[PDB]
Design a protein around this nucleic acid. Structure first.
Lengths: 604, 52, 434, 66
DNA sequence: AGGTAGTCACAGCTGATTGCGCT
DNA sequence: GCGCAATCAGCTGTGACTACCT
């Protein structure tokens, strides 16, 4: 509250430092938790904090977590009660809980189970234990449109009433503003109305303890609740979804991002679920393997939310699909859920549990907050540092090596400002030489190399100069698949170029070296995804930027997610043996010739 | 040509972060390393292409 | 500056007088290199000089540089002296006084360094080691606050004058409190044992103004260095000049004493360390300090942005702007790195190195940002009609030592403003002589 | 003869100063004489505005975390 | 004296057309 | 002549740059 040095000091607020330091935790009045990792009780404190709060940074020594209303909702969703969490937080405080958190925790946890949402006979109902709250929200104008025709009293038994199916998102957004958040609990143990399927995973696909913890938190009291699980791409992500689908034992719907991720999910199901191919169906307008009458359906976005005319067969498939309940609707790459057309997808299908999986939950436009009510609370957030300490995740040695701007290019860079400077620092001759040197070194040491490069116009001359395979992106489907398939099991070729195509969950093979050049501006999601394509110092990835350009600021502002995850970006300013061998653009003649071909765009 | 190669190398390899780093190295320890532990830590934290 | 640098600049007579105290010889011995100590121990029981070649042959050829450095340091400290061995050879033998005092300090002999301790019996108002440490820390914090200028710190006028003499603070106008200079900030950033030693070296340099014997002060300081913590000694047996020095040390917190007339004095932990962790540093440019005193808070806030201040913790963020401001204040990046390494928490000691390389590299790169542009005032000459004429003027300027930059290809040269007049006069004379 | 201040820097900053000279970003052509690819000669009466411009360029592409 | 819908780049998807192959 | 695969039109997501009102 005091600003003697510009720092919020709370010395007087929390003086309960009785005896004496044995509790490795610090609380903040507004809200924050600081955890000391070098403590004998580190594991238990970490388990307690994960179940109640989401992390904000996990460096090697002092973790920092944040307390949010949705985190407390998730905590109270599990068997943890208000008294237990309060007494255990007071147990490990070392400073005393300020009287702004206990009131906040109490207010958040009081209104959890008052309002519930249920699905029955393809109808959405809102049920409340206390009848008074219904009259409390009756005067709200937005809610009154949901009922039709006005739902005079909907006398049952406990007071509940029907709501408009297509306006469920609006009421979900309103309820949290009304301090009456909705809960999505599916008691699949006793339904007797939904036709459960005979899916059963093979008893040979073992899972790691963190996956066990995530699943156990998903099923806390014998029921499944909608949530989000964040795991690295290299780690086991599809396995968690398959296990959840098997445990739910209901008709499963899987949504992917690309037309190739559906094949990935089908392969995962065929590998770890022992499901006959008749029940498995893929609905992506490619083979149409009779999706009508199926147990497990896999499809992708941008197909369930078409606002234009649809195919005749696809129309009938959608009509059939929108006439029955769904069990554990699984969404992949949940981070790009809050979109103009992707949000309505959850409103176009009916499901009991909505499970979202992703590796990079960070996104711009601050629309991640909407995901709290679109699907549910952030359930699990894996700790990447301890994950790679166990050896199951490759310990990637991050590097941020920059190159000076050549004199023939910096003049043009400072001369132009109307969006024409991207190619100038993208095609820096010094950065080109650094990339070529890294390629040659890691080919001499026999490491698989993936070079990410947006602005495919530059990538053309970047790849044809070295005469190496590249993926333009609008090429074809077979060519990309065959290139990626022969990239792994071929000693002759061990380096590929990707232009914004690998910025999603694909089937790229294991690689040890990743080099990114001229990516998007501040896409922390993109850089985190690119890093995820390497881990699965076993590996290491480099980022090349041009000094005294906007790319420096972009690289600085895009790595904050990874440093929050615990990674450190070493700065490399000199490359050993740069002049030992011959590289391209050795003389100034071709460097100044490059100016004409890089200014030859003239997109006017 | 040969002169162009040398000129380009001089411009590139020592543009911003050498006109001071090289001068500091000329005015640096010069003698042997502090301890063997420092050298081991440096080798561990150095990249494979920087140790050749 | 270290002890060896100060000892090298002393006259031979002062060095000879210093060796008369057994404690001084041990202190000098422990400052020697590892190779030198073995040579001193080998020659401890020798009454005859040894040939220089024989001594040189002890060490292998590959390590001859270290042998030469050790021999040069020993010669500079005058521990041993070259003796004119009969037959044209040069013999090396230790100083007899230094050898005798070292043997007394090691084997034994003579009287104790202190007069006595049980003559007065137990102390009526004896303190404890934690109390002594608290008193020393409070005195040091008071001194450092007086360096800043807070009214809560009140010290003697002589201490303020000494600080002014050290250059840390300047008094532009009499009466008004002095202002701390950039050297004051650099000294504050220094480690406490380094700060104590620098202050003691300044005191020794300025002692001749107060008419105090350098040899006696050095011997007493070295004796205090080897004193046992928590054990008092008799004040008696010292000159009145040494009494003022003892009172000054008591004001500095090195030695505790209940009263000026008291016959007892208790050396503190600072005094023992005069002979020679709470900060956790994270890869995300965050400092977690386990401190409560305002001194460490100010020191950290000098080069970082404060975020949170828990009653027993300080959470700060090391940002580019804060480091740039601190460097503009006069603190170099190397001093900041050394300060962070010294105050490193014991947990960080497991990591090799203790400070993560990325943070140190980023700090050093931030330091280089301020001095990216180099500014050198001067006068440019570009009106050379002939190549030969340019070369002669360039050679004359280099002789005068005023040349800043030269370019023979375009016949361009830059001279210092002070040397511009001389070059102009030379050029005028050359044209007249032509 | 010319009297002023010699400025030594990397070629990128030298070209930035040249662009400032040609674009008249400081209001005049005070960047008179260029001597080397890494050295320039500037009149000393406006070193402050050059420092301000250099600082603005440096911290523009920096993304301070403050 | 200080902030958001068009606009641009680069990818994705699905809905048709549309020339190419033939024991 | 029919059938399969290549191709484009239209719509959308992601991130960043830019011209008029409180």
């Amino acid at each position: 509250k005091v600003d003697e040095y510009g720092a919020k000091d709370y010395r007087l607020q929390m003086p309960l430092k009785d005896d004496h330091t044995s509790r490795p935790l610090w609380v903040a009045p507004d809200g924050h938790i600081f955890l000391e990792a070098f403590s004998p009780v580190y594991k238990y404190a970490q388990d307690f904090l994960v179940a109640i709060a989401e992390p904000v940074c996990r460096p090697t020594h002092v973790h920092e977590y944040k307390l949010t209303a949705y985190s407390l909702y998730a905590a109270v969703s599990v068997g943890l009660q208000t008294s237990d969490i309060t007494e255990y937080l007071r147990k490990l405080s070392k400073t005393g809980v300020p009287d702004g958190i206990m009131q906040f925790i109490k207010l958040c946890t009081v209104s959890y189970g008052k309002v519930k949402l249920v699905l029955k006979h393809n109808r959405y109902f809102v049920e409340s234990c206390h009848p008074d709250v219904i009259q409390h929200l009756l005067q709200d104008p937005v809610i009154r449109e949901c009922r039709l025709r006005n739902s005079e009293g909907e006398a049952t038994e406990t007071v509940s009433f029907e709501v408009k199916q297509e306006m469920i998102e609006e009421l979900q957004k309103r309820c949290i503003h009304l301090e009456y958040p909705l809960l999505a609990e599916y008691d699949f143990r006793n339904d007797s109305v939904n036709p459960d399927i005979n899916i059963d995973l093979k008893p040979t696909a073992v899972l790691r303890p963190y996956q066990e913890k995530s699943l156990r938190k998903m099923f806390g009291n014998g029921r499944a609740r909608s949530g989000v699980i964040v795991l690295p791409c290299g780690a086991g992500k599809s396995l968690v979804g398959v296990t959840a689908a098997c445990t739910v034992r209901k008709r499963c719907l899987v949504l992917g991002n690309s037309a190739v991720s559906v094949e990935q999910w089908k392969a995962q199901f065929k590998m770890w679920s022992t499901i006959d191919d008749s029940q498995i169906c893929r609905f992506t307008s490619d083979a149409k393997d009779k999706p009508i009458g199926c147990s497990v359906a896999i499809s992708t976005y941008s197909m369930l939310g078409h606002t234009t005319k649809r195919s005749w067969e696809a129309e009938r498939v959608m009509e059939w699909l929108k006439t029955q309940e769904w069990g554990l609707m699984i969404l992949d790459e949940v981070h790009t859920i809050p979109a103009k057309m992707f949000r309505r997808v959850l409103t176009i299908v009916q499901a009991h549990c909505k499970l979202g999986l992703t590796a990079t939950l960070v996104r711009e436009d601050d629309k991640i907050v909407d995901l709290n009510f679109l699907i549910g609370p952030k359930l699990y957030e894996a700790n990447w540092m301890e994950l790679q300490n166990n050896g199951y995740i490759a310990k990637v040695q991050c590097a941020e090596v920059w190159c000076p701007m050549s004199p023939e290019f910096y003049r043009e860079y400072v001369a132009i400002k109307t969006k024409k400077r991207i190619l100038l620092y993208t095609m820096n001759p010094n950065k080109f030489r650094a990339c070529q040197f890294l390629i040659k070194f890691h080919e001499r040491r026999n490491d698989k190399i993936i070079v990410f490069a947006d602005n495919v116009f530059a990538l053309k001359e970047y790849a044809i100069r070295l005469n190496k395979p590249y993926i333009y992106g609008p090429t074809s489907q077979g060519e990309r698949m065959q290139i990626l398939q022969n990239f792994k099991h071929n000693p002759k070729i061990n380096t590929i170029f990707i232009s914004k195509v690998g910025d999603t969950s694909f089937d790229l093979p294991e690689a040890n070296v990743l080099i990114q050049i001229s990516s998007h501006g501040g896409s922390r999601r993109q850089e985190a995804q690119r890093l995820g394509r390497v881990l699965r110092y076993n590996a290491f990835f480099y980022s090349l930027v041009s000094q005294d350009t906007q790319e420096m600021a972009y690289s600085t502002k895009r790595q904050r997610f990874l440093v929050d995850q615990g990674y450190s970006f070493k700065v490399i300013t000199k490359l050993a043996g740069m002049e030992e061998e011959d590289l391209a653009f050795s003389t100034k003649e071709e460097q100044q010739q490059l100016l004409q071909k890089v200014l030859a765009a003239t997109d006017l | 040509g040969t002169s162009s190669q040398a000129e380009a190398a001089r411009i590139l390899a020592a543009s911003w972060p050498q006109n001071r780093e090289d001068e500091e190295k000329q005015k640096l320890k010069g003698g042997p390393k502090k301890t063997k532990r420092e050298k081991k830590a440096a080798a561990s934290h150095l990249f494979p292409f920087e140790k050749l | 500056r270290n002890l060896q640098e100060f000892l090298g600049g002393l006259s031979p007579g002062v060095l000879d007088r210093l060796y008369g105290h057994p404690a001084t010889c041990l202190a000098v011995f422990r400052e020697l290199p590892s190779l030198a100590k073995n040579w001193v121990m080998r020659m401890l029981f020798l009454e005859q000089p040894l040939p220089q070649a024989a001594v040189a042959l002890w060490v292998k050829k590959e390590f001859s540089k270290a042998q030469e450095e050790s021999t040069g340091l020993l010669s500079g400290l005058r521990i041993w002296h070259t003796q004119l061995l009969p037959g044209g050879l040069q013999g090396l033998i230790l100083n007899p006084i230094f050898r005798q005092n070292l043997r007394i300090a090691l084997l034994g002999g003579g009287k104790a360094w202190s007069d006595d301790t049980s003559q007065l019996g137990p102390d009526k108002h004896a303190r404890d080691v934690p109390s002594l440490d608290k008193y020393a820390e409070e005195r040091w914090e008071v001194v450092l606050h007086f360096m800043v200028g807070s009214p809560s710190a009140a010290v003697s006028q002589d201490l303020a004058q000494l600080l002014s003499q050290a250059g840390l603070m300047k008094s532009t106008e009499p009466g008004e409190p002095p202002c701390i200079t950039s050297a004051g900030f650099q000294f504050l950033l220094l480690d406490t044992p380094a700060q104590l030693w620098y202050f003691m070296l300044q005191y020794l340099q300025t002692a001749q103004s107060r008419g105090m014997d350098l040899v006696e002060i050095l011997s007493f300081l070295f004796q205090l260095s080897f004193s046992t913590l928590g054990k008092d000694y008799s004040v008696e047996g010292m000159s009145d000049s040494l009494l003022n020095f003892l009172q000054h040390l008591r004001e500095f917190g090195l030695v505790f004493q209940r009263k000026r007339k008291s016959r007892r004095y208790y050396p503190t932990r600072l005094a023992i360390n005069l002979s020679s962790g709470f900060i956790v540093v994270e890869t995300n440019y965050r400092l977690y300090a386990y401190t409560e005193s305002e001194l460490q808070i100010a020191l950290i806030a000098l080069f970082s942005e404060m975020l949170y201040r828990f009653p027993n913790m300080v959470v700060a963020q090391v940002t580019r702007e804060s480091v740039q401001q601190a460097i503009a204040s006069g603190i170099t990046a190397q001093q900041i790195i050394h300060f962070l390494r010294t105050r490193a928490h014991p947990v960080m000691l497991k990591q090799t190195p203790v400070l993560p390389p990325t943070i140190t590299d980023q700090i050093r790169l931030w330091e280089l940002e301020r001095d990216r542009l180099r500014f050198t005032e001067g006068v440019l000459y570009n009106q050379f009609l002939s190549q030969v004429d340019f070369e002669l003027l360039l050679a004359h300027a280099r002789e005068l030592g005023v040349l800043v930059f030269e370019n023979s290809a375009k016949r361009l040269m830059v001279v210092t403003p002070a040397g511009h007049s001389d070059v102009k006069r030379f050029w005028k004379r050359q044209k007249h002589s032509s | 003869v010319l009297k002023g201040v010699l400025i030594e820097c990397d070629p990128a900053m030298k070209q930035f100063l040249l662009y400032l000279d040609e674009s008249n970003a400081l209001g005049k052509k005070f960047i008179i004489q260029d001597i080397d690819d890494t050295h320039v000669f500037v009149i000393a009466e406006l070193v402050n505005v050059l420092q301000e411009r250099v600082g603005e360029l440096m911290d523009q592409n920096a993304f301070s975390l403050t």
